[PDB]
Design a protein around this nucleic acid. Structure first.
Lengths: 128, 395
RNA sequence: UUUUUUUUUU
RNA sequence: GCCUCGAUAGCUCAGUUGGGAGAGCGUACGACUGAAGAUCGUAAGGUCACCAGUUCGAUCCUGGUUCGGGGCACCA
RNA sequence: GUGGCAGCCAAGCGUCCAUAGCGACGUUGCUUUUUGAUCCUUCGAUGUCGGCUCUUCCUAUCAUUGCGAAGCAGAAUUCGCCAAGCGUUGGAUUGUUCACCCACUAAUAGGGAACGUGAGCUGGGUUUAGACCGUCGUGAGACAGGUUAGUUUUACCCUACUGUUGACUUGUUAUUGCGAAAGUAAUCCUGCUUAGUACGAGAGGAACAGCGGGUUCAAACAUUUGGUUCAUAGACUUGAUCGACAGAUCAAUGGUCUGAAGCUACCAUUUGAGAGAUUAUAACUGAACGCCUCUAAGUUAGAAUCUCGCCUUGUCAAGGCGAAAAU
RNA sequence: UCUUAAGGUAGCCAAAUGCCUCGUCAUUUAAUUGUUGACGCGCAUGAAUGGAUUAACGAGAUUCCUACUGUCCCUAACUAC
RNA sequence: GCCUCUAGUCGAUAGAAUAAUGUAGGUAAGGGAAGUCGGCAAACUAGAUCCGUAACUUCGGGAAAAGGAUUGGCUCCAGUG
RNA sequence: GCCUAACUUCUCGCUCAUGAGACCCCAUAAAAGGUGUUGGUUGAUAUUGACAGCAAUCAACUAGCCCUGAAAAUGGAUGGCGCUUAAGCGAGAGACCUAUACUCC
RNA sequence: GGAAACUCUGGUGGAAGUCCGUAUCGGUUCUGACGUGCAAAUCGAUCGAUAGACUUGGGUAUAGGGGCGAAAGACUAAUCGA
RNA sequence: CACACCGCCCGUCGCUAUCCGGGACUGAACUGAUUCGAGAAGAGUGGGGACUGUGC
């Protein structure tokens, strides 16, 4: 994956775009980040992160889970020189190996995330 | 007491002191190692940073996610009109370093080359090289010049040609030319001296110095910003909003002992206008002068057939029109527009794939860089927008 | 004047 | 982490220069009663937390491991 | 002393086996990041905790480079050597240093610099005067017991440091150069392939080379995307004024929308690398010591170390040293 | 059983009052020396030295949710002086 | 509050320029307290008409609770002496 | 030896340390180690040929110098430079230098 | 509306140490400005009250171990645990 | 009371089982209504007029 602008620092709340029953995803940490002093870990489309459900089914709340970012509002540059962004920040709950807990995704999925995660691409309806 | 949490120091202490460059022209601090076997060639050139644009190219990078795909890349145009060889100088090794042995100037020096020796050329009598010129047509002067050539051939281990830019052909305000010593690589010392002598008073084109898809270095002075505080000069963390006496500062500038401020602490001062040497800038195109038939359409490619020159719609902002030969470098170049850039051949033996990658331009943007350009040519603009009240009243 | 208790089933 | 204290039968507690592992509850049986409960008697309950050492001889004394319980632990 | 750290002998542990790794009973040291002891300096005053910010230094080495040893068949792990070049994070509670937990990570090493750093900040704590509670006191009042509110002054001087001019001396004016000396920079990781190979009961599970990318750091730059608008640029609009329309003005930038230019963002883009001598170590030849032996003489390979290159400065007092032009 | 003039009653509580202490359990959080609710042999709570509540009110002390945001990630630009 | 009429003022040492630091104003992509002892500071809310309004309560309040819709110009219609 | 007035003066040894050592108080070092080298002690074997391989040797001790034990924070201290048949360590010899001391004026 | 007790609805009225807010009186936070100041206590924004236990002029009374105090040892002419 | 007063019998406390209540937590879940905001699709109307019959 090429570098893209990150727009979801720790503490962000994104929509849960799958059918697991969760409605919110609160970014706790981002995988692969060894930051610097006073720098918030940030995530962009196609990034796995540690999250917790703030609103949703009680069985999914009050516990630490993993999610993957599928859409972001922060515009990012593709290698063809285009600048693209979505209407909302969205993510999907996954396990530690990339398997998606749910089975369907509402809305499009970024090409950057689809290329990295085959299962998410499979469950996605549209790919943007 | 140790600092609680570690953090790298702010800035590179090997680029200090952050002072204004001693000279406006970039100084070549090192030339490529000379290999006697290769053909005689120049190792540097002088150009002007005209402006930036972006291009579309097909990428040939096996294993990459953009293999056989089209990508958009930013490029910089450096106008490089041919230079004139005005002299020959050589250097002899001594226990304290190389030392210039002698300099032989061409018989006829251009007025703009001679201007460089002046601060008030217009007010002066323009007597520079007047007596030297006569030596070329004198019995004793010819003997002295021949002896100087013999000395260069016999004692020197490095040969440089003094070259100067030509300023009249640009049709701009400045007329004083820039002189520069460029080392000659290839062939023995005798061959180098003969080659320089033949090329005295002659023009050298940039395409004879640089090839396409070649990595070069840019030497010059960066863009100036004047006196600046630490937050901008060194990029230190801003202090809290509640700070009395200012927050764009460094809180602690040293410990009690040593009882002095160290040179490694961030302080306010000059920012920008620093001498720099950036290496590994890839050449994407060497375009010919737009005033010649070959360069009549130096802004088009093999796949974009529109007849257009490199100059964008409305000219290069704050620079002018690029009508001479130019080099299209990839990415950013130091200095502002109009800045004089010294191009140097790479000292490194390039081995990475990017060095040998072949660049294939598919399209070059020539839309106006003032505002948000919507058209690539004035003809296209007029064709799209139709006919205006001005044209109606012209009819 | 003081005077509390009495295992389970049969 | 440091000062320590203790570890004994299914459970709870005694005990020793160091020279025997006791008591109770609990368990099995017997007596008693029409039959039980209760009560009595017997049988009983243990690697003395584990290891190494010192001793003629250690459950006890010294060191270590485990388990726990009580306390101590900037600063101006 | 206490705290911390490191050794010596081996009784034992380690299935057997004192020394892989430990090491009791004893015993020798080192350090001043603990706390004590003292009272030497300061009471015509050295601003007394912590955090924030920012440098540099030390290693008693957590990670990374090169290695040796295992109770080393490999993710992993342990011991040790040369090694401080370079990193050693985001948070919840607490004033907290500590502590504890959540998460990521190559790793979440320990410390110093007047317990670094208040004319750098803050003022949460401590640490006056107001006030409350508990205990104590006949009482005024006391309490390293708890609680709430409580003014943080001055640099224009010298030096240091940061940048900026710049004279005199080698005649003067410019031009073009050399390198002395000083600075110096890169860092860690992985997706694919190696390979489910090596390996061999399996379970499991690697590496070097190659390709593509990224983290932290650094130096630039504005073509594109983004931000900034007294460009007082264009449009609109509330209230009021100029008799009305039109044109405009004022409301300390009247307000809303768009907004070039310039400046600017890992919020866009570009660039970041080579030798030499060698350390530990592994070896060659080879005695001493007629055998052995990497060592004694002599030889090899050898690293995030060191020196140099590349890169920045180069008003340099044997007034640092050249070429060349006109005088 | 010793003992007082009486031996803390009704209530309330780790409280602005609890040292041990960051008490134990539950609640709030991904994570809590914080909040709230419980427990109470309470170093040292307690009844006009007033106890327990309490609508409305508060430039009073504290915790949380939402909205909001340059407080911050991480800084940038502009104006007046 | 903002603009204006009568009346009164242009008195605040001036000029050039717009570096750093500052004091005072104005904005900021994505996130939204992760900053900090602590949401300190800033931002958010607001006028008027219609609708709707909880626990609790000393029955008076809470209450502008919470929370929705509308709002300009022009041409008309109707009502109110 | 030069800073520094006075010898690179004379004799015999010991020491090589990948920063050795270098002069009262005094400006730290130990237990424990070395098949580095130099001397000694004791006990053995050896020319009726000692050990090694298909003409002296072996073993255990001892004590001089050197080495390991020996880690700290601004860059730094035998006083500095430097010194290696020394300009170091030990035993000595000639001469020489130098006080406000001693003799004389 | 009701058998009664009394209840309900719409108006009128204009109470309160009621509320928002201007003049005014204070002086919460910024721990803002300044801190050899405009100033020996001021300046800006933000704030408390605003028909009463209200804010105020003048005349009068209380004088130092005394006064006066909705109580801070506060004030008593920049002086107050005398 | 009738096992006949050596009768019968009541509460607290302690053990076990079981059912229920209160209860901080703006606790949680399911489901139905209503206001408001957005709003697919069809149908009505006003335009439109690709295409093709003779200005319509």
């Amino acid at each position: 994956k090429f570098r893209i602008s990150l727009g979801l620092p720790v503490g962000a709340v994104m929509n849960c775009a799958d059918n697991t029953g969760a409605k919110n995803l609160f970014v706790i940490s981002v995988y692969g980040i060894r930051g610097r002093l006073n720098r918030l870990p940030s995530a962009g489309v196609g990034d796995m992160f540690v999250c917790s459900v703030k609103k949703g089914k009680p069985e999914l709340r009050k516990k630490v889970l993993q999610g993957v970012v599928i859409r972001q509002r922060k515009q990012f540059r593709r290698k063809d020189g285009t600048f693209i962004y979505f209407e909302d920040n969205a993510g999907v709950i996954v396990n530690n190996k990339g398997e998606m807990k749910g089975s369907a995704i509402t809305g499009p999925v970024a090409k950057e995330c689809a290329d990295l995660w085959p299962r998410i691409a499979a469950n996605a309806g549209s790919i943007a | 007491s140790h600092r609680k949490f570690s953090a790298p120091r702010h800035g590179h202490m090997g680029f200090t002191p952050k002072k204004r460059s001693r000279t406006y022209r970039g100084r070549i601090k090192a030339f490529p190692k000379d290999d006697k076997s290769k053909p005689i060639h120049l190792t540097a050139f002088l150009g002007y940073k005209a402006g930036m644009t972006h291009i579309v190219r097909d990428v040939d990078k096996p294993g990459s996610k953009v293999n056989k795909k089209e990508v958009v890349e930013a490029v910089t145009i450096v106008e490089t009109p041919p230079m004139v060889i005005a002299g020959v100088t050589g250097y002899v090794d001594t226990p304290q370093g190389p030392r210039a042995l002698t300099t032989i100037w061409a018989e006829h020096l251009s007025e703009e080359a001679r201007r460089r020796f002046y601060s008030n050329w217009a007010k002066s009598k323009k007597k520079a090289f007047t007596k030297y010129a006569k030596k070329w047509q004198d019995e004793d002067g010819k003997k002295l010049i021949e002896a100087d050539f013999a000395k260069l051939k016999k004692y020197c281990s490095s040969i440089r040609v003094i070259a100067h830019t030509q300023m009249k052909i640009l049709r701009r305000r400045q007329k004083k030319a820039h002189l520069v010593e460029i080392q000659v690589n290839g062939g023995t010392i005798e061959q180098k001296v003969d080659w320089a002598r033949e090329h005295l008073e002659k023009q050298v084109q940039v395409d004879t110095v640089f090839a396409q898809d070649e990595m070069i270095d840019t030497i010059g002075v960066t863009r100036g910003h004047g006196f600046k505080g630490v937050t901008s000069r060194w990029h230190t963390k801003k202090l809290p909003r509640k700070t009395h006496k200012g927050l764009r500062k460094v809180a602690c500038i040293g410990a009690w002992h040593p009882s002095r401020v160290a040179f490694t602490v961030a302080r306010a001062g000059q920012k920008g206008f620093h001498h720099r040497t950036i290496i590994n800038n890839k050449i994407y195109r060497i375009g010919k002068s737009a005033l010649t038939e070959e360069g009549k359409n130096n802004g088009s490619t093999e796949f974009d057939l529109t007849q257009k020159t490199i100059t964008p719609m409305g000219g290069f902002p704050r620079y002018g029109i690029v009508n001479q030969d130019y080099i299209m470098l990839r990415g950013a170049v130091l200095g502002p527009k109009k800045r004089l850039i010294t191009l140097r051949k790479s000292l490194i033996t390039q081995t990475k794939r990017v060095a040998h990658e072949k660049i294939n331009l598919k399209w070059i943007d020539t839309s106006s860089k003032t505002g948000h350009g919507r058209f690539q040519t004035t003809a296209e603009k007029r064709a799209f927008m139709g006919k205006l009240k001005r044209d109606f009243l012209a009819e």
